[PDB]
């Protein structure tokens, strides 16, 4: 009685475009074109697909199948699979928090640009502003200029001294105080996700119609726009020129694996939640297949969208697009790409749809990000919770604002990197490995093939079987070992992070991980019996 059976989605296309909305984000736009053109160019497509087929797709489809089959949250599903690994559901809840502290501040920057892009003369065109230094040298100014080590462009000056105000902080040590503009921007973001999540899957699923389709439109406008620019073939040459020798490096495969994993994002509980609210009779194999193939191809065309404008920018400057595309991160889109689109007709248009496109890219993904955690807590503490959804949703949203207050600082950008590199990647890889191993090895991949066989009507192929049993946990294990062995020294804006950052990072990387061995200790520590007896009753799910 009472609630009993769970709710169901409003249409097939909503959940298709919804999982597509989670899959597609900023990184699809600029991360993949950079990592592609840097690691052997077009040849990077060869391992990228392999790491997709053997790694990303199986985790994606396994996660999705479990989600639609068991209809449980990220915490409650472990109660009915492997209770000792229930802490996994908790770990994600912490991980997501760390992500929601920086991912939306980027959307706040794109939002600050968007509202600052309504003026007839764009701010980052002239140097006669209140934030530019004496180094600021700009165009529509005398030709022959010969750039100096200390000179700075109006776009770099605008991004550095205004929207970030990063010159007012010395690094991780001193980063305060808070830029209230980005606080209001990210507040508006938390509002626009508040009215798109608070109701549940119906609103996220309806806002997704806009948040997942518009990026293709803006990418299409900047695509046909960037294609008509003179000398844009340079960026395409640098973008797709095959350099097969780079394929001999054992690093490149690692980069491809990490890319496809962190662009499909399986085992994060978001796909579990998005899959939970669907029909048991409804097919999901085709769903997972098509959805991934969209995320990959969308990245492929996004490469052109970026490197066409970068090619035109390298033509107006002096070629070897790599030099104009050295820095990967927020500067490739907020400085180089913005300064590139500044010299184009009706620049207000392309600017508005560009930064609006950035916000539109982050919105759907963060919808899904929150959706997974919300589903997990509501399903884990029912009746004690579900009293209202706006209460718990409001709680997690304002929590994400207070979490971003460290990021809204002057040196917030610094923290963004520290959180983007150190915290998420190793832990997420770990929980994906433990999750995959627990579904494929503990629960038994045989019974999983029986669950899919009861789901779609047919048992999954021997390919999916061997991928889940061996190829996928080895796929995650690869990136785990390669990551731990060579953690990266990182620098941003002529500032090398202190030696101790990794320590801090490891804290932020493990402070979220402590819950699973301590929960195994809590489960095995709480029920008396013998060690062999209690772990045998704790590995087998509920019989009824």
């Amino acid at each position, epitope marked *: 009685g009472s609630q009993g059976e769970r709710e169901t989605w409003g249409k097939k296309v909503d959940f298709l475009l919804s999982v597509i909305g989670y899959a597609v984000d900023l990184g699809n736009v600029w991360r993949f074109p950079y990592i592609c053109a840097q690691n052997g160019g077009g040849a990077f497509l060869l391992p990228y697909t392999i790491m997709a087929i053997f790694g990303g797709i199986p985790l994606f489809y396994m996660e999705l199948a479990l989600g639609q089959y068991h209809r449980n949250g990220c915490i409650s599903i472990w109660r009915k699979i492997c209770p000792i690994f229930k802490g996994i559901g908790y770990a994600i809840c912490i991980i997501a928090f760390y992500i929601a502290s920086y991912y939306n501040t980027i959307m706040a920057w794109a939002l600050y640009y968007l509202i600052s892009s309504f003026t007839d003369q764009l701010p980052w065109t002239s140097c006669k502003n209140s934030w530019n230094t004496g180094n600021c040298t700009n165009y529509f100014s005398e030709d*022959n200029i*010969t*750039w*100096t*080590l200390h000179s700075t462009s109006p776009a770099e000056e605008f991004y550095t001294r205004h929207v970030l105000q990063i010159h007012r902080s010395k690094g991780l040590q001193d980063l305060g105080g808070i830029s209230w503009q980005l606080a209001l921007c990210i507040m508006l973001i938390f509002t626009v996700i508040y009215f798109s999540i608070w109701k549940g899957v119906k609103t996220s699923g309806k806002v997704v119609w806009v948040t997942a389709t518009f990026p293709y439109i803006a990418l299409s406008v900047l695509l046909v726009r960037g294609a008509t620019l003179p000398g844009a073939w340079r960026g395409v040459l640098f973008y797709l020129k095959p350099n097969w020798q780079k394929l001999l490096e054992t690093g490149v495969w690692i980069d491809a694996a990490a890319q496809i994993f962190f662009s499909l994002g399986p085992g994060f509980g978001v796909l579990l939640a998005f899959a939970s609210y669907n029909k048991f009779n409804n097919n999901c194999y085709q769903d997972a297949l098509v959805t991934s193939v969209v995320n990959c191809m969308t990245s492929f065309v996004s490469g052109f969208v970026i490197f066409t404008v970068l090619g035109y920018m390298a033509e107006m400057r*002096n*070629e*070897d697009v*790599s*030099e104009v595309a050295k820095d990967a991160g927020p500067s490739l889109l907020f400085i180089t790409y913005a300064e590139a689109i500044a010299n184009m007709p009706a620049s207000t248009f392309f600017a508005i749809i560009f930064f609006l496109m950035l916000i539109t890219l982050g919105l759907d993904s963060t919808f899904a990000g929150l959706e997974g955690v919300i589903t997990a807590v509501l399903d884990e503490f029912p009746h004690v919770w579900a009293k209202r959804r706006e209460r718990f949703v409001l709680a997690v949203v304002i929590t994400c604002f207070f979490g971003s207050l460290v990021t809204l600082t002057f040196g917030g950008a610094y923290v963004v990197k520290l959180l983007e590199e150190y915290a998420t990647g190793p832990a997420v890889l770990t929980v994906a490995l433990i999750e995959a191993v627990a579904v494929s090895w503990f629960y038994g991949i045989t019974q999983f093939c029986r669950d899919v066989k009861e789901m779609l009507g047919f048992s999954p192929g021997w390919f999916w079987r061997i991928c889940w049993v061996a190829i996928s946990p080895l796929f995650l294990l690869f990136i785990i070992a390669s990551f731990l062995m060579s953690p990266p020294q990182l620098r941003l804006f002529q500032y090398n992070y202190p030696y101790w950052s990794i320590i801090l990072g490891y804290a932020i990387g493990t402070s979220s991980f402590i819950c699973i061995p301590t929960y195994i200790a809590y489960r095995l520590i709480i029920t008396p019996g013998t060690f062999k007896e209690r772990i045998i009753k704790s590995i087998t799910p509920e019989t009824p």
Partner: antibody, heavy 119, light 108 residues
């Protein structure tokens, strides 16, 4: 005006090391990249690498990686290039030349440094 | 990398004649070629940058042209002191490479 006074000629036995100076003057030293070009007898110019005087930002050439080491000192506005594992091919004239960051031309050069690697 | 090829190692000209040295690059360069003048016994002296622009302190008799891959250095009034070895160098892709060097010998 702008002057790049290099060091005198050096006669060094093969297998040893040799350091060449480059006293820069006449401009804001921290405003320009400091480059090193190699010129073999009867050969063309060969770009060794550059250095950012502010933080010692050395950007070398794959052909000279581990062959040359560029350093810089702001307290005296002087850039140095050290060479190890000296052979008969290194017996060439070396120049230190100033360059902006873009466009990357070599506006002012030094008088050259005659290096002879022989026992 | 980039290979700057000066096919003609030597070029003969006379005082007052119109002389032009060619320069072939590996790939497309747009307008990123600088011409240097190394007089026998002196350091290379910068004459042209970015294909056509002249550098400061260079007489009007030195000009530059070309757009794409092949570029040309022109002297209208050759003087007795214009006797030198001319090099061409690209300035877009890392690393920066030079030409083989064209010695300009004067005929009398």
């Amino acid at each position: 005006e702008v002057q790049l006074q290099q060091s005198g000629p050096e006669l060094v036995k093969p297998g040893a090391s040799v350091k060449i100076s480059c006293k820069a003057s006449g401009y804001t030293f921290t405003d320009y990249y400091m480059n090193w070009v190699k010129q073999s007898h009867g050969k063309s110019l060969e770009w060794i690498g550059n250095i950012n005087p502010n933080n010692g930002g050395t950007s070398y050439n794959q052909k000279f990686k581990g062959k040359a080491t560029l350093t810089v000192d702001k307290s005296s506005t002087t850039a140095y290039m050290e060479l190890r594992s000296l052979t008969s091919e290194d017996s060439a004239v070396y120049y230190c030349t100033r360059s902006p960051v873009r466009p990357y031309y070599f506006d002012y050069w030094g008088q050259g440094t005659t290096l002879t690697v022989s026992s | 990398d980039i290979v700057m090829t000066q096919s003609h190692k030597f070029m003969s000209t006379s005082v007052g004649d119109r002389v032009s040295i060619t320069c072939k690059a590996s790939q497309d360069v747009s307008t990123a070629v600088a011409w240097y003048q190394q007089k026998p016994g002196q350091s290379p002296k910068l004459l042209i940058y970015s294909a056509s622009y002249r550098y400061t302190g260079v007489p009007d008799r030195f000009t530059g042209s070309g757009s794409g891959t092949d570029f040309t250095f022109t002297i209208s009034s050759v003087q007795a002191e214009d006797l030198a070895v001319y090099y061409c160098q690209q300035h877009y892709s890392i690393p920066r490479t030079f030409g083989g060097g064209t010695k300009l010998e004067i005929k009398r």
